[PDB]
């Protein structure tokens, strides 16, 4: 239909009103702004002035009517937090947003037994007035209709669910920066979207006023610094560091020798004129990295000064330290897509369900006034638009991966236009991608820069076991890489300064022998560690410490660790070689950005280690190594062994599958338990690998030999054990398995000690392996072991949230808790008097 | 096969005046004998088949009676599949003469032809694996 | 619960769990069950020198997960770090 | 504006949008309606002359609203009474089914493998070729233990002995059809030195050109907007007014004895109830005229099939061709004055006897 949009009137004998009306408001009724022009007909050649007295005032108006639902006050502080008011998320608004930015995503769609979800831009629906009402203060003076929208951004605070219906979305609102630039002033703004008191996202918007600004009384700038890190080397940094005023530690006799330092800064700024700041405030915590990587708190930064030109702070830190960049390129780029997508006809859908009724984008005479080239397409428009294919492509349509999004407005947009949005796999962020993208019109014209933060498929790390290593393993990765360099190094020199070998020399030469010399003062120090290493057993209420390495004395001048075939294959060096090649790895992953926040991890036997080293820094490298050498020379000590480092144990992978397609884990466990009981050597099922596919059983050579001899007469006579034992005789079967055992134990019992097991149908031998990993044989290892773990596995570095739900042990295979139901079970598999403790007085820890 | 069916249909087509004796035998027939099932193919191709009125569809391979081709005669055998009726042009008779009085088939092989059960059409395919009725599969040359 | 004695029974349990690991079978069906069925795991990544876990991963899936992987569309990587480094590190050929 | 796209063809939107049930299950209805006055008035009949001349009418999931629809016609004075009640049933079963269970983005992954292993772009509705019903319901039936309730696939039409389309989300049918391409034999895989028994079957699988889940509990909330849309906009079919038995989609019985509404059955067979093609084409008949859409992909060529050797002959009643087999007839078939308009398919029980 036909409405007014502008009346040209006199209002007094000299004053010109064009009364500019929108009729698409908040409430129906029509929205005038009253433009005032002189009329002086002394002047002929130029009669018409504008009356610029309260003209952005006036402006001001009618965006408060069009944008705000409050009272028309312009006298608040852009210091001050702006209240937004409560916001529930209706499925009508979701489909509605949805369907006017054409996002098609199945998570915002009403689906049978499925909660709806709303998308992140769903944001500056709710946040929009709280947001927009920061450049509307008195003190931020500008022409609303020479405004500006830079860019906007959305980042899911890390935890936070996505948006629902149903939600009640409370909003805050505050003034970042104001500055003062030469073509214009900036106005950054930053909002908090909060559920149920947590907040959930923020929203960045930058403003743009264009015009001459000179009020630099009403300017103000925070920034978030960069993170920078030093090094303190040598006395001369640390000298340099104290002579700084603004570097204040807690502990005034903290050493920083060989410390890395990290500074978190962030710089509050006023203006006296556009180069000189009338005042700089840098403050922020100091951080020392401790042995586990974690950052604590050792003092802050506290600088403040008046007139200024500068940051003497962050000047000192970028000269003296390195920035740490959270975000990650890729060696090269990965196209994911170029899509097409449209403008819609009309800007009046957009501006229904975004509350952005802005009549530069629906007013022909308000975008004409304003000097636009049509009616624009909201930038939120193309924001959410873009966002949409982003979503669709780079997280494959599982809206929760999106996690933050910025788009630059580079180019206004008109109705109708057909975009071409390139998308772009560029770096990773802390595990998550970071896509960027660029939009462009028709006429090649970048509109629309910005990135994207997505999460990666959901991730699980699983460590790798003992039986693995082979020489040179990790050693690529050694070369290359400065974190698992980082690595290997602080570990060699562990081992080099503590017990006088180099884990990188084992790993590289695998030496079939290693003598350690005692030799000198250096030789005694050493001497005394591996005399040190000692066994801490409570027998009777009594500390009994017993010595590994009992041929080590205050005679000795060396020591020998003995193998047949190379040292790595020995446990209490396989154990440290295998935990660093993972640390290593996993290390360069982590600092590529590779490792998403929640990832889940478990280990396998010695993976646990370095799994829990890795995801959950519980040790450090030094305890690490330390913690599974202990844990090798206990193995080495329960097992005797020859003159050239040889067991009389070992282990099979048994295929229960390959031996007869009737013959179940039920049948494994069976016939084992027969083999273990009739020659009263030890076999045991020890590792659960693969469901009727792969079993290891562990123990006495002679008793795998005999397990191996037993399933390869059994394949070949086509007999089942289950069937006979069921349908044929009752306990018949025990007795006629007793002499098919004999007959095998008979052949094992003859071979030599050292016997070379065979490779059968059903059965294959694990190669460098001579402990009976995981049987009952090791269950005296347990108490001295605890105890070491107790004194090396300090509690300040256990984080929970690190394992809570992440972590999977071998023992218990249910993701860790620490919940009674959880402990009970532990005590269920291992009976333990500290466990059963904590479970009977659970109720006094809860409170 | 389907494929030498269709090589029979093509013939039938470029002489559509003269009778072609389409001979149809599945692999549980005497002699040298296909991977095929007799209903099958039938089943698929009858319509193709009767498409061509030069054709003469003769079912052989199992039969030895009036009361087991029958069914085929009158078409009903195709009705046990869900499939309209599909009668027979006539059938042939190889395995079922081998012991006729005029055959120089020798009394010992007529005594251990006469020997052979045989088994019903279900599990003629046991014949690639063991004796089956008497009866098994081996390669020629 | 308080945040430090919560943090005083995660290392009493982590203590016990690793302690009694030295001596109790490893449950590597449970766990694979866990993270396979449990948590719907897209990307298993194996950080050893050999893909022991990883064809440990594959075959458990191809015996007990294909209808489940088919029926829900789940697309699973199984990734071993000495050998998919280019899957791992997004450094794919040009 | 059907008129201006019809008018111009640059200004038809795209097929994606023409294929949404709003607007394509009116539109099928149009198509059929004006094959059927096309087919009266080239025979100078009334509507309801060329109704009388039939035995019968029924449809094939919506053409099931069109078959009543001719059923209630008698004079071109009132033909478009009948016009609208069918064109309104057909608006408010494409818009309450489509607020029901709207198309979604599919992941491009899921899009992309599923060009590159030869399968259709997904949809509503997989069309499973040379499996029995059994067969199908067994994958299905694996599929669904999985699955939750509101993603669980079901058989909607059974259009032959081995001729089934399984309707539900798009991404639980491509999770059929991952389970389907292990178990189908390659196209190119010679089985001819394998015994019988021990061959690979092999099969067909393709997405159906359709954009909603017809005859599926996914657009069961639909259905009591569609019947009170209908006593909104006075749409009813009365069973005195229904000249010629109009058959069931799902038992085959003639709509004329139901005790309730004709109208909320017909809803019941489009949305809910499956199609039983063959229990509801056991009807006798010497010809059978297809109107439905798709000339020789339609209902008619597929009917052929089913009906082979048996003496009924298809009329593509909505196309003109030329069919070199001659199994089954077109447009000019009808209208030919000649021997050639009274074409006999064979009977083989007759023929043969
Ligand atoms: C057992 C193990 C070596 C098998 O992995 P692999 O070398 O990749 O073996 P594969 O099964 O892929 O096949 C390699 C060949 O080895 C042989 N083989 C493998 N498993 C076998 C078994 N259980 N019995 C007999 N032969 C076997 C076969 O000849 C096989 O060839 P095939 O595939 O034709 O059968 C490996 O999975 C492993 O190291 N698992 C044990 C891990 C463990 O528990 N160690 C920790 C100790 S605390
Ligand atoms: C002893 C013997 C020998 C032959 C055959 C069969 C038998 C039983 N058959 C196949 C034969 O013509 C016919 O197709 C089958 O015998 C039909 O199956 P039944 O044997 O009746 O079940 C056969 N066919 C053919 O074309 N030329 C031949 O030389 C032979 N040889």
Redesign the interface.
């Known amino acids: 239909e036909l409405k007014p949009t502008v009346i040209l009137k006199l209002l007094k004998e000299n004053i010109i009103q064009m009364e500019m009306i929108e009729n698409r408001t908040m409430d129906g009724k029509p929205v005038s702004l009253p433009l005032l022009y002189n009329f002086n007909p002394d002047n002929g050649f130029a009669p018409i002035s504008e009356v610029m007295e309260d003209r952005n005032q006036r402006i001001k108006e009618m965006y408060w009517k069009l944008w705000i639902d409050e009272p028309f006050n312009l006298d608040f502080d852009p210091r001050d937090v702006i209240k937004g008011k409560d916001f529930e998320i209706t499925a009508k608004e979701v489909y509605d947003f949805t369907h006017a930015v054409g996002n098609?995503?199945?998570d915002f769609?009403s689906?049978?037994?499925?909660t709806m979800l709303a998308p992140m831009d769903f944001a500056i629906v709710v946040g929009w007035r709280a947001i927009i009402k920061a450049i509307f203060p008195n003190t931020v003076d500008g022409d609303l209709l020479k405004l500006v929208h830079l860019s906007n951004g959305y980042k899911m605070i890390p935890g936070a669910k996505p948006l629902q219906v149903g939600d009640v979305v409370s909003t805050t609102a505050v003034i970042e920066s104001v500055v003062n630039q030469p073509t214009g002033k900036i106005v950054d703004v930053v909002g908090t979207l909060s559920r149920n008191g947590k907040p959930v996202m923020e929203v960045t918007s930058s403003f743009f006023y264009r015009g001459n600004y000179t009020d630099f009384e009403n300017t103000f700038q925070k920034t978030v610094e960069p993170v920078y890190q030093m090094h303190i080397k040598t006395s001369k940094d640390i000298a340099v560091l104290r002579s700084k005023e603004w570097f204040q530690l807690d502990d005034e006799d903290f050493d920083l020798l060989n410390k890395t330092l990290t500074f978190e800064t962030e710089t509050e700024v006023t203006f006296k004129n556009a180069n000189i700041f009338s005042s700089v405030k840098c403050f922020g915590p100091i951080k020392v990295e401790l042995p586990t990587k974690e950052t604590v708190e050792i003092g802050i930064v506290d600088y403040e000064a008046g007139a200024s030109h500068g940051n003497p702070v962050v000047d000192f830190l970028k000269r003296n330290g390195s920035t740490l960049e959270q975000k990650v390129n890729?060696?090269?780029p990965?196209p994911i897509?170029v899509l097409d997508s449209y403008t819609p006809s009309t800007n009046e859908p957009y501006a229904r369900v975004s509350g952005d009724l802005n009549p530069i984008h629906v007013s022909r005479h308000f975008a004409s006034y304003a000097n636009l080239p049509g009616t624009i397409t909201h930038g939120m428009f193309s924001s959410a638009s873009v966002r949409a294919l982003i979503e669709?492509?780079a997280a494959?349509?599982?809206s929760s991966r999106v996690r933050g999004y910025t788009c630059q407005f580079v180019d206004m947009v008109l109705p109708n236009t057909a975009l071409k949005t390139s998308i772009q796999?560029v770096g990773?962020i802390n595990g998550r991608?970071l896509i960027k993208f660029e939009t462009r019109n028709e006429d090649d014209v970048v509109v629309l820069t910005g990135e994207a933060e997505i999460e990666?498929?959901?991730?699980?790390?699983?460590?790798?076991?003992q039986?693995?290593?082979?020489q040179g393993?990790?050693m690529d990765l050694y070369k290359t890489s400065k974190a698992a360099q980082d690595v290997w190094n602080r570990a060699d020199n562990h081992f080099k300064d503590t017990y006088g070998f180099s884990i990188l020399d084992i790993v590289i030469n695998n030496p079939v022998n290693l003598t350690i010399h005692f030799g000198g003062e250096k030789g005694k120090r050493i001497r005394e560690n591996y005399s040190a290493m000692i066994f801490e057993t409570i027998v009777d209420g009594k500390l009994k410490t017993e010595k590994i390495f009992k041929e080590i004395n205050e005679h000795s001048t060396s020591y020998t660790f003995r193998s047949e075939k190379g040292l790595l294959s020995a446990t209490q060096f396989t154990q440290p070689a295998?935990t660093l090649?993972?640390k290593a790895?996993?290390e360069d992953?982590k600092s590529?950005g590779?490792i998403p926040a929640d990832a889940?991890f478990?280990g396998?036997?010695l993976?646990?280690?370095?799994?829990?080293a890795?995801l959950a820094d519980?040790m450090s490298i030094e305890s690490l190594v330390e913690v599974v050498f202990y844990?090798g020379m206990?193995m080495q000590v329960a097992v005797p062994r020859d003159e050239l480092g040889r067991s009389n144990y070992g282990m099979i992978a048994i295929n229960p599958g390959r031996v007869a397609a009737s013959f179940s884990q039920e049948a494994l466990q069976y016939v084992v338990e027969r083999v273990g009981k009739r020659t009263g050597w030890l076999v045991?099922?020890?590792?659960?690998?693969?469901?009727?596919?792969?079993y290891?059983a562990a123990g006495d050579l002679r008793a795998l030999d005999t397990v191996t001899n037993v399933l390869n007469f059994i394949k070949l006579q086509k007999i089942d054990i289950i069937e006979l034992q069921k349908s044929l005789s009752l306990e018949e079967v025990e007795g006629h398995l007793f002499e098919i055992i004999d007959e095998a134990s008979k052949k094992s019992a003859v071979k030599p000690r050292p016997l070379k097991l065979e490779r059968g149908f059903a059965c294959i031998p694990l190669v460098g392996i001579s402990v009976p990993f995981?049987?009952?044989?090791?269950?005296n290892?347990?108490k001295p072991?605890?105890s070491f773990?107790?004194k090396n596995?300090i509690?300040?570095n256990?984080?929970?949230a690190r394992?809570?739900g992440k972590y999977?042990?071998?023992?218990?295979?249910?993701?860790?808790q620490?919940t009674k139901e959880?402990?009970q079970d532990?005590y269920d598999?291992?009976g333990?008097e500290?466990?059963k403790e904590?479970i009977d007085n659970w109720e006094k820890?809860?409170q | 096969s389907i494929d030498a069916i269709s090589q029979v249909i093509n013939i039938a087509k470029a002489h559509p005046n003269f009778p072609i004796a389409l001979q149809w035998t599945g692999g549980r027939g005497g002699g040298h004998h296909s991977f095929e099932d007799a209903h099958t193919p039938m089943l698929q191709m009858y319509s193709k088949i009767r498409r061509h009125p030069n054709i003469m569809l003769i079912f052989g391979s199992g039969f030895g009676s009036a009361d087991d081709t029958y069914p085929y005669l009158t078409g009903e055998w195709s009705t046990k599949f869900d499939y309209p009726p599909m009668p027979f042009d006539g059938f042939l008779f190889g395995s079922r003469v081998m012991i006729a009085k005029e055959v120089k088939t020798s009394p010992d092989a007529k005594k251990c032809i006469a020997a052979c059960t045989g088994v019903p059409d279900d599990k003629w395919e046991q014949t690639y694996k063991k004796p089956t009725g008497g009866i098994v599969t081996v390669r020629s040359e | 619960?308080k945040?430090e004695?919560?943090?005083?029974?995660?290392?009493?349990?982590?203590?016990?769990?690793?302690?009694?690991?030295?001596?109790?079978?490893?449950?590597?069906?449970?766990?694979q069950?866990?993270?396979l069925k449990?948590?719907?795991?897209?990307?298993?990544?194996?950080?050893?020198?050999?893909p022991?876990?990883a064809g440990?991963?594959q075959?458990?899936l191809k015996?007990?997960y294909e209808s489940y992987d088919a029926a829900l569309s789940l697309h699973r990587?199984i990734l071993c770090?000495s050998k998919d480094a280019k899957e791992?590190?997004?450094?794919?050929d040009? | 504006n059907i008129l201006e796209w019809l008018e111009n063809p640059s200004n038809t939107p795209d097929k994606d949008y023409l294929l949404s049930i709003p607007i394509s299950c009116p539109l099928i209805g149009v198509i059929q309606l004006a094959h059927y006055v096309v087919t009266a008035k080239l025979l100078g009949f009334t509507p309801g002359e060329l109704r009388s001349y039939l035995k019968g009418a029924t449809g094939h999931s919506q053409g099931l609203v069109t078959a009543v629809a001719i059923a209630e016609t008698d004079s071109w004075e009132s033909f478009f009474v009948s016009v609208r009640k069918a064109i309104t049933v057909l608006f408010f079963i494409g818009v309450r089914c489509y607020e029901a269970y709207?198309?979604?983005?599919?992941?491009?992954?899921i899009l992309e493998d599923s060009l590159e292993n030869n399968e259709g772009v997904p949809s509503p509705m997989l069309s499973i070729s040379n499996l029995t019903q059994e067969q199908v319901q067994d994958y299905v039936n694996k599929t669904n233990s999985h699955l939750?309730?509101?993603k669980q696939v079901e058989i909607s039409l059974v259009n032959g002995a081995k001729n089934l389309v399984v309707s539900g989300p798009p991404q639980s049918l491509y999770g059929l059809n991952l389970t389907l391409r292990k178990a189908k034999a390659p196209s190119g895989l010679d089985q001819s030195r394998i015994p019988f028994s021990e061959r690979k079957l092999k099969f067909s699988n393709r997405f159906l050109p359709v954009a909603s889940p017809f005859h599926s509990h996914?657009l069961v909330?639909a259905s009591d907007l569609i019947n009170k849309d209908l006593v909104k906009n006075n749409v009813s079919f009365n069973a005195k007014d229904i000249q010629i038995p109009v058959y069931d989609t799902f038992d085959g019985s003639d709509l004329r004895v139901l005790s309730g509404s004709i109208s909320e059955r017909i809803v019941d067979c489009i949305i809910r109830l499956p199609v039983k093609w063959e229990t509801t084409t056991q009807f006798k008949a010497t010809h059978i005229l297809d109107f439905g859409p798709g000339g020789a992909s339609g209902l008619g060529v597929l009917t052929h099939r089913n009906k082979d050797g048996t003496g009924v002959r298809v009329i593509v009643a909505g196309t003109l061709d030329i069919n070199p087999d001659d199994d089954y007839g077109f447009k000019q078939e009808i209208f030919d004055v000649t021997s050639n308009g009274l074409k006999k398919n064979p009977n083989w029980l007759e023929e043969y006897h």
């Open positions: 098609n995503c199945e769609v689906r049978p037994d499925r890729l060696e090269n990965i897509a669709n492509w494959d349509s599982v796999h990773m991608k990666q498929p959901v991730t699980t790390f699983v460590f790798t076991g039986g693995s290593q082979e393993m990790g295998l090649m993972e790895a996993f992953l590529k590779l889940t478990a396998h036997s993976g646990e280690y370095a799994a829990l890795s519980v844990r206990t045991e099922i020890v590792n659960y690998n693969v469901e009727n596919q792969q290891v995981h049987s009952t044989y090791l269950m290892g347990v072991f605890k773990l107790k596995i509690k300040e256990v984080k929970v394992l809570a999977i042990p071998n023992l218990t295979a249910k993701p860790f620490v959880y402990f532990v598999l291992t333990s500290p466990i904590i820890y809860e | 619960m945040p004695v919560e943090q005083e029974l995660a290392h009493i349990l982590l203590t016990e769990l690793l302690a009694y690991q030295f001596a109790s079978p490893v449950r590597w069906i449970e766990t069950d866990v993270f449990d948590f719907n795991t897209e990307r298993v990544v194996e950080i050893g020198p050999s022991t876990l440990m991963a075959r458990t015996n007990k990587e770090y791992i590190y997004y450094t794919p040009p | 709207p198309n979604t983005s599919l992941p491009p992954s939750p309730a509101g996914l909330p």
